[PDB]
Design an enzyme around this catalytic site. Structure first.
Site, PDB file in Angstrom:
ATOM      1  N   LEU A 163      47.826  17.760  38.859  1.00  0.00           N
ATOM      2  CA  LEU A 163      48.589  17.968  40.395  1.00  0.00           C
ATOM      3  C   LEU A 163      50.047  16.897  39.928  1.00  0.00           C
ATOM      4  O   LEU A 163      50.754  16.800  40.235  1.00  0.00           O
ATOM      5  CB  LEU A 163      48.088  17.630  41.171  1.00  0.00           C
ATOM      6  CG  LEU A 163      47.588  19.673  41.619  1.00  0.00           C
ATOM      7  CD1 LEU A 163      46.659  19.240  41.447  1.00  0.00           C
ATOM      8  CD2 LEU A 163      48.414  19.055  43.234  1.00  0.00           C
ATOM      9  N   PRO A 211      38.931  13.278  38.955  1.00  0.00           N
ATOM     10  CA  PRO A 211      39.591  12.935  37.808  1.00  0.00           C
ATOM     11  C   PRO A 211      40.901  14.620  38.243  1.00  0.00           C
ATOM     12  O   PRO A 211      41.735  14.369  36.889  1.00  0.00           O
ATOM     13  CB  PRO A 211      39.057  12.114  36.892  1.00  0.00           C
ATOM     14  CG  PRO A 211      37.848  12.840  37.672  1.00  0.00           C
ATOM     15  CD  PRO A 211      37.486  13.290  38.490  1.00  0.00           C
ATOM     16  N   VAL A 212      40.561  15.356  37.226  1.00  0.00           N
ATOM     17  CA  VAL A 212      40.910  16.428  36.499  1.00  0.00           C
ATOM     18  C   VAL A 212      41.729  17.123  37.609  1.00  0.00           C
ATOM     19  O   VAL A 212      42.957  16.908  36.435  1.00  0.00           O
ATOM     20  CB  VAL A 212      39.847  16.772  36.379  1.00  0.00           C
ATOM     21  CG1 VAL A 212      40.532  18.846  35.403  1.00  0.00           C
ATOM     22  CG2 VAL A 212      39.313  17.090  35.297  1.00  0.00           C
ATOM     23  N   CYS A 213      41.382  17.172  38.659  1.00  0.00           N
ATOM     24  CA  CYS A 213      42.181  17.624  39.796  1.00  0.00           C
ATOM     25  C   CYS A 213      43.766  16.559  39.666  1.00  0.00           C
ATOM     26  O   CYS A 213      45.001  17.136  39.457  1.00  0.00           O
ATOM     27  CB  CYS A 213      41.618  18.030  41.270  1.00  0.00           C
ATOM     28  SG  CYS A 213      40.214  18.685  41.016  1.00  0.00           S
ATOM     29  N   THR A 214      43.221  15.713  39.650  1.00  0.00           N
ATOM     30  CA  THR A 214      44.678  14.341  40.104  1.00  0.00           C
ATOM     31  C   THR A 214      45.648  14.668  38.760  1.00  0.00           C
ATOM     32  O   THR A 214      46.688  14.454  38.592  1.00  0.00           O
ATOM     33  CB  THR A 214      44.184  12.984  39.846  1.00  0.00           C
ATOM     34  OG1 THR A 214      43.548  13.231  41.233  1.00  0.00           O
ATOM     35  CG2 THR A 214      45.202  11.881  39.973  1.00  0.00           C
TER      36      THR A 214
END
Lengths: 218, 219
Positions: free
Chosen positions: A49, A43-46
């Site tokens: 980005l 989730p954090v990565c999403t």
């Protein structure tokens, strides 16, 4: 990779292209920011980005490339990108995301996370940032852990500071944003100000009587 | 040198405001700590940063977090420049120890040298580093800004709150997160274990991949 080191060239697979991605070809005559993220489909990565995908034009117009990076496969990146697009309300993905499945580049760059591992039990990268000049010099770095998403506003703010202070004898103060007054570098002599500045210097007198506290509005 | 999760080394050094030796592990025992360097005393960006952190010192102490400064200047330089910083910030006292590394031993060890900045003697100076250090002396985050570029002091605090929150709770903070905002549930926390950790309900967001990792929680 200390400040001022030369960021090394590499060839890698990347999202959205079929051939080899070579770094130096991609960033020739450009600022670059290379940023890693631990794992695709998390989730954090999403959120990060998706945000950088929105801001991509803000960067491109300052002549700065964005390059992503994780220890996931290409097929992972390409599928995950449709998630990032959906979450972020994006209709065109443009940031190349490098693949580093062997972890060779992650071990060489020294960006592994303290904690995060993938499904196979192999380690993953932290949230790194490298700000890189047209000459391949590492101007600034950040290493955030997998736990702590980055501030994408801060990324554009450092870039603007780096580009301003690249060509003009100033330094940007605490919390500076574009449009605010900056500092005159402390070694710039007073006999030397008008060659460099159209506008007036403001001097702030210090108890020590030293004359280093000078602001300029460009 | 000192990558994420590595142990931050103990050191002892001279420092502003005290006449004895400063020992790092002593000062930060059972404490979060943020070690921040600046290139040179008596220079403008450094004065604005230090004034700001001085104003913010209570914010940090309330969170059980020690602030420690660092440059390659002597104590005598630090003590005098402190009065400049206090004047610029409208402060009445100063309580952040600023350590001294005149020999450059610590800065070469920490690998915090600036690419360009040199003092009046021709010797190199540090960049603007941050090390965020946990109560177990582990480096949780770092930043290396150059001399040309002042840090964002709001961001230092945002990061500390994030590192403290995720230290004790199975969450990770999304991009641009501030305290109070929903955060993310870690992608490995399974369903059975969700209610041991969370009083408030979770929000799930459906993804084209039909994977279930996109979960927010309001704490």
């Amino acid at each position: 990779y200390h400040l001022g080191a030369t960021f090394p060239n590499f060839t890698a697979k990347a999202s959205g292209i079929d051939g080899d991605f070579e770094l130096y070809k991609y960033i020739e005559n450009s600022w670059a920011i290379l940023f890693s993220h631990p794992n695709d489909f998390t989730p954090v990565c999403t959120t990060e980005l998706a945000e950088l995908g929105k801001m991509h034009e803000d960067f491109l117009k300052l002549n700065c490339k964005l390059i992503g990076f994780s220890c996931n496969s290409k097929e992972s990146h390409d599928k995950w990108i449709e998630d990032i697009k959906y979450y972020g309300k994006l209709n065109k993905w443009e940031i190349p995301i490098v693949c580093d499945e062997s972890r060779e580049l992650a071990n060489k760059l020294k960006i592994m996370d303290e904690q995060e591992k993938d499904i196979t039990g192999l380690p993953l990268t932290c949230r790194c940032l490298f700000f890189i000049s047209p000459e391949k010099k590492i101007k600034a770095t950040v290493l955030y852990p997998a736990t702590t998403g980055r501030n994408a506003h801060e990324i554009l703010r450092v870039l603007k500071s780096l580009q301003l202070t690249y060509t003009t004898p100033v330094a940007t103060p605490v919390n500076w944003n574009e449009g605010d007054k900056c500092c005159v570098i402390p070694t710039l002599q007073d006999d030397e100000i008008s060659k460099h500045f159209k506008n007036e210097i403001t001097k702030v007198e210090m108890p020590s009587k030293k004359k280093y506290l000078r602001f300029v509005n460009l």
